[PDB]
Amino acid sequence: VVLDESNPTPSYKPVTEQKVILPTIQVLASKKRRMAENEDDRGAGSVAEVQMREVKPIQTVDVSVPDHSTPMEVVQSLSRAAQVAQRLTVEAMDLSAPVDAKPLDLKPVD
Amino acid sequence: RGNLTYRLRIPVFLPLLAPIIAAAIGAIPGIASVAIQA
Amino acid sequence: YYNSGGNLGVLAGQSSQLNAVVDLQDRNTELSYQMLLANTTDRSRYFSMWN
Amino acid sequence: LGCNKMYG
Amino acid sequence: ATPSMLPQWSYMHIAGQDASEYLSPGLVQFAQATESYFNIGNKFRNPTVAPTHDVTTERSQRLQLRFVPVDREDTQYSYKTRFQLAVGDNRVLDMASTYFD
Amino acid sequence: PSMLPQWSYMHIAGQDASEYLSPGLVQFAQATESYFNIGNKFRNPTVAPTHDVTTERSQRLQLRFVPVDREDTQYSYKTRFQLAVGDNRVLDMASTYFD
Amino acid sequence: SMLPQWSYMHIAGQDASEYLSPGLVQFAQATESYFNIGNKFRNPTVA
Amino acid sequence: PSMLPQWSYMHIAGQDASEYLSPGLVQFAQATESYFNIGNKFRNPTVA
Amino acid sequence: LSAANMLYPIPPNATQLPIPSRNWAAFRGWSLTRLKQRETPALGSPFDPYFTYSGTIPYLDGTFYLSHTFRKVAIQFDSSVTWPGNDRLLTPNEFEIKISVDGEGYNVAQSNMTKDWFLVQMLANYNIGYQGYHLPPDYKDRTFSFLHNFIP
Amino acid sequence: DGEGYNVAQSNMTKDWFLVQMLANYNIGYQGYHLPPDYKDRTFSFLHNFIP
Amino acid sequence: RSQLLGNGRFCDFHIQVPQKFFAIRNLLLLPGTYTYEWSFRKDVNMILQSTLGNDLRVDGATVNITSVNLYASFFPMSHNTASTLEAMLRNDTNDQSFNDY
Amino acid sequence: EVMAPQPTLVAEQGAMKAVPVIKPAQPFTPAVHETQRIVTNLPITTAVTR
Amino acid sequence: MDEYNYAALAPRQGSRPMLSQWSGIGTHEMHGG
Amino acid sequence: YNYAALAPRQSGIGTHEMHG
Amino acid sequence: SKEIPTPYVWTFQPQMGAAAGASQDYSTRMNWFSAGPDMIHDVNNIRDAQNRILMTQSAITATPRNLIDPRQWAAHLIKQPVVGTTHVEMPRNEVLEQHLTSHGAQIAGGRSSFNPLQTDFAFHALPSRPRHGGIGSRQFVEEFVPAVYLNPYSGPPDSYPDQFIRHYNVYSNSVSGY
Amino acid sequence: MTFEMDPINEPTLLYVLFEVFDVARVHQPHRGVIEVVYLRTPFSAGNAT
């Protein structure tokens, strides 16, 4: 139970413990930063970054969402995605580019 | 960026975890243009 | 007027009404600027803004 | 109770 | 006691506190009891402070915008104008504005 | 929807040639730069900073000061200028020529 | 007998990369390509 | 409290000249005062 | 009327001028209006030998009529920064009141006054401009209000 | 030209001169000095600007 | 209304026309680019009004329109709260519903 | 707890053997430098060599 | 590392910001000839 | 975000206007 | 200098009762260009002693906090003013006076002879809430003492000492523009 | 501080002078060397350390 506690980024500090998914999810707030030119600069925006981390013998993902997003909704969505990834780690994904349709007419009958 | 950053430590052809997380984030109504970086 | 004793330019703040530009007539800032340009640039090419 | 009225 | 013991705004009740919370509780009760016929409440002043953050942008954005049509066609019965209005990146507007000039 | 993956793939904003090329090819190129010079065959982004550099708060570039008072004797022309450096803006006086 | 004055006026002593604030040195070395406060400070260059 | 060192150094608000000068100098000034009178080369605080 | 009244004389043409350094804390705004010099008496002196004018005194009576003779006003802080900066106004450098050329638009209602000044007045008097323009309620529309006296 | 609004001795205005100098040499904010020789090519601005 | 654009047979009119459609006139529009076309009537009888019910086609009025612009007004609010309001208003359960009076 | 006093520096350069010299500037590094309050009561953080 | 120094201000060259050398600040031009 | 924007310091939602 | 720097003297903002930024103490400073090494050493020693006294005074009389200057302070931290008891000497009973008036008597002037009972009131006329808000001058001069900054602007810009610049919002860190 | 005074036609200048505490200390170490320090406590032209 709870294997890795490394905090790869020093600028972000943990705010909740590594709650487990019945993977583990950890919420990290950000420490103080430099001055901003104006207060309407931190939460301004909608793009979300999903940063990938090197595999630690487990994989770590840094997902950052804008402020206005509800933390409960973000946590639930991330938990559902983690459960789906754990279950699935197919031909359906292969169908959606490198399988072709007309070339899939010699093999089925010949 | 944002004050809060969420971290998942999954125990762990074509990568799938990053597209799955991107789709889950894009499912949020208030978030658009999900960026994937490695 | 750069080094003239009589007409002396002033750059002063609002605090103490004290000049931050002092000259003693032993300085030649015109020649100083001439030498500065001659050493920092190739002045065989004219510049109409400062002649 | 109090009052807070003026021009503006 | 104006600048030393208290700040001036709080002392003069410009930004400090409401009358019902800086007056004595007995005086507040008396004013409430005798409000019908003697009305103490006029003599005391409330701060009425305005919010100072997370209300306005101060990020150099305009209030009024003039949009010219991208194209116009006019039969001798109707005058059709086509506009495309760009709603900033973060700002929002209600269409109670946007009158045709 | 974001164009960053395409920019990175086309070497518009992604990464330097010293760090997206294979290390063996980088070593080969730096070894043969003397006589073969593969170096110019690759592109690197050279991206500009995106924040904390420009005001974006309605700041002028050129500012004109009229003289608060001036006198014109028969030998000299004295003008007093009250220049104020904004509140947040900063200038070096290599500018501020007398017009 | 005038070293305190010469060091104060940066005639002899530390370079601008040493006697200045490290934050100011970092800012100057960052904003060199467009703002370049590098020429605003003196160096002793003592023989 | 935070300016006493500087003030007493410049004798802005400090010790009297009769008690921060050397006793030899005080005696010398008290003796050779009818014809030399070096006593006006030093300052006295006179604090309020 | 919590305000510092400052009456500056105007020669019978053109434009005017402004104030020195100060703190500007808890400031609330400007209120500008032209009066007739003949109608405004002296204040400090107990008696005014040069008044010679009965009738309404706008300055201490509240009967202003020359306020429509304003073309534009510009406010500068530190002689470097314009007040209505941040591109707030249609003419972002200064407040226009009346525009007569009317080559392009920027004229509101069906009168001489311009749109940015109209919006400024709506916000100052009734807080209306942002959510569309509408008639303010009767209690908020009073004798010294704006739309109560605005006559195109 | 009601006001000054002219750079050097020519028709070019000060703001346009500032814009051109910045775009071509990154020299608009720390004085108008003659750009280095290697930055002044044949397609440059001051290599051809003749007042 | 007649005196507001002046007397005289010919006159220059500078008018502002609102949006009266129920689903639009109160709509709070979130960020984005929207094509806003509208066709303006040029029929004199519908446009103009006279104390007498006289036909104006035969009399001859021929209203001529030079330019048409719309003027959007934006509340300047902090980008944090603007994006927060956008985030709530983009939600499925926070859809804006209007009625015809 | 008041900050411990910092030693003053005096270097040597040429024949000049007693030039007053300020402490050299170094970019902040977490391994070498740490932020310590000058006065514990109010936060005025500054870099020290641990 | 971009939090311990001004590296976002400097123009980038891919992923490595182009900072100046540490001993680059300061200047000295002086002669009488 | 911080509990929405502040209010001026010292049915709310919805309209039901109809009939004609 | 980074070992013996001049202290930052705070500026008081009497309207809203907060520190209006800090600036170097350029008003009270010695001039030692005319001094030799001995006198310069004495001046440096005096400046160092001044900085030590300032740090000691700060550590003594400065209330500990995580912010250099909070615009609004907790109610208990602010020194509330003490007010004494108020005694209300009730001059006359009302029920007995009403009885006398009903029985056909006129009472004028005004303790009273007819009423034997005497009642007195005493209470503390304290404010309903204990005036949370800004600082006063007296309770400011004992907390915002001249703060010496040993290594000027060394360390991360996160750890740069803000609140020194006058136009800086404390919460939601940002510089307040025009 | 502000002043209002009687108006006179010829241009004039105000001569407000702030009573600073100006003191100089003279120390002469040895044999023809003289070194001094100055302190004008309210309005000084000082130096760093």
Automatic annotation (TrEMBL), chain B:
Transmembrane segment boundaries: 13-36
Organism of derivation: Bovine adenovirus B serotype 3
Record localization: Virion
Main subcellular localisation: virion
Protein name, entry field: PX
InterPro entries: Adenovirus_late_L2_mu_core
Keyword 4Fe-4S: no
GO molecular function list: DNA binding
GO cellular component: viral nucleocapsid
Keywords: DNA-binding, Late protein, Membrane, Transmembrane, Transmembrane helix, Virion
Domain of life: Viruses
UniProt keyword Nucleotide-binding, yes or no: no
